[PDB]
Amino acid sequence: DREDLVYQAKLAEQAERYDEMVESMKKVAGMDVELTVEERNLLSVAYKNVIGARRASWRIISSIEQKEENKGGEDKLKMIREYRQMVETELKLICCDILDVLDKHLIPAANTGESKVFYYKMKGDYHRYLAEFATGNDRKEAAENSLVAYKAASDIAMTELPPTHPIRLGLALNFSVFYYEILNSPDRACRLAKAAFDDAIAELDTLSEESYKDSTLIMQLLRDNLTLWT
């Protein structure tokens, strides 16, 4: 039945029906077991597409708000705002859902370094998405939580994954993105990104057969952001 949930997850993925792919993988996370690499990727992809869609809508709607803000079209702005807010509510719910699954099931039942780094990194990511559109104190809370999860993923990763491991690199990438876009700290964003790249270049022999394209790509992305930021 675990094997069926995974199969249904795959069916849902091919059909591009991500809500159900989330439902399938939630159930598998609810079994309080260590998930396979496959099942971690399925969960991740399920939740990324579902959140991805709203994040895309939120930006489109913000852009239009900003347009109507500069033209002073106040009648439309009421509608734009109500609509942004509805989407923010979806984003909150989706993020709270996975954050909960992480705290109550995935993180507790994790037993390898790879999965622990993955889950705390995920938790950092999802708090960071809450923070992308939050204001004031809510923004603060998501920032503190996101920092705390990214530090926890970092502590375990630093001691337990080669610097080439794509999860470690992915962690560096996003944690440096966090510092730049959320803490508004280009100096730390760049020191972190530069170091993670450099550490993987110093040990390129440690690249796995399984994940060299993933790693390569992540390092390309590290490079692209350093450019962007300088």
Partner: peptide
């Protein structure tokens, strides 16, 4: 900024 691009994330993974």
């Amino acid at each position: 900024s691009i994330s993974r």
